[PDB]
Amino acid sequence: SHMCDAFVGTWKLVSSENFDDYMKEVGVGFATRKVAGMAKPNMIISVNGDVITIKSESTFKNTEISFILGQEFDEVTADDRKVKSTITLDGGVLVHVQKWDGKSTTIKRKREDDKLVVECVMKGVTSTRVYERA
Ligand SMILES: CCOC(=O)c1ccsc1NC(=O)C1=C(C(=O)O)CCC1
């Protein structure tokens, strides 16, 4: 048993708050915001040794990242940003920082009751996205 066991599985989005404003702050353009805001992704998390894989699958896009905690990687986001990402575990929370063009956003993923709660912050704007087991 290990680092991220309680994250592993297949999760479905059940609520989203403030995501349009988060995307505006990030710099996402109108048409992507409208279609992305409509998406109801499944999040699929797996672990093999030190490598964590997180997939996001929706009608808009299917994306995948694999990474080792603390080790930076290049990521193309669903909205087509080319970012440098680092993901760590802080007190049982996965903390994912994306850097690009002098900007930064942080995405936290944590287990709360039977939910996986995703909090997305860009300057002063937060979006909260709640997932349940599929
Ligand atoms: C920010 C532009 O996003 C998109 O364009 C987008 C399109 C489908 S799904 C998605 N973004 C997400 O689902 C996100 C999170 C999540 O809930 O995994 C955490 C932060 C983003």
Curated annotation (Swiss-Prot):
Family matches, as InterPro entries: Calycin, Fatty_acid-bd, ILBP, Lipocln_cytosolic_FA-bd_dom
Keyword Nucleotidyltransferase listed: no
Resulting phenotype, residue 25 to D: In a breast cancer sample; somatic mutation
GO biological process, one term: cellular response to lithium ion
Keyword line: Acetylation, Cytoplasm, Lipid-binding, Nucleus, Phosphoprotein, Transport
Modified residues (Phosphoserine): 15
Residue sites binding a fatty acid per the record: 129-131
CDD domains from the UniProt entry: FABP4
N-acetylcysteine found at: 4
Location in or out of the cell: Cytoplasm; Nucleus
Segment forming the signal sequence: none
Phosphotyrosine, modified sites: 22
GO cellular component, one term: cytoplasm
One MF term in the entry's GO annotations: long-chain fatty acid transmembrane transporter activity
Motif (Nuclear localization signal): 24-34
Role noted for this protein: Lipid transport protein in adipocytes. Binds both long chain fatty acids and retinoic acid. Delivers long-chain fatty acids and retinoic acid to their cognate receptors in the nucleus.
Family membership noted in the UniProt record: Belongs to the calycin superfamily. Fatty-acid binding protein (FABP) family.
Subunit description: Monomer. Homodimer. Interacts with PPARG.
Free-text comment on this protein's domains from its UniProt entry: Forms a beta-barrel structure that accommodates hydrophobic ligands in its interior.
Protein name: Fatty acid-binding protein, adipocyte
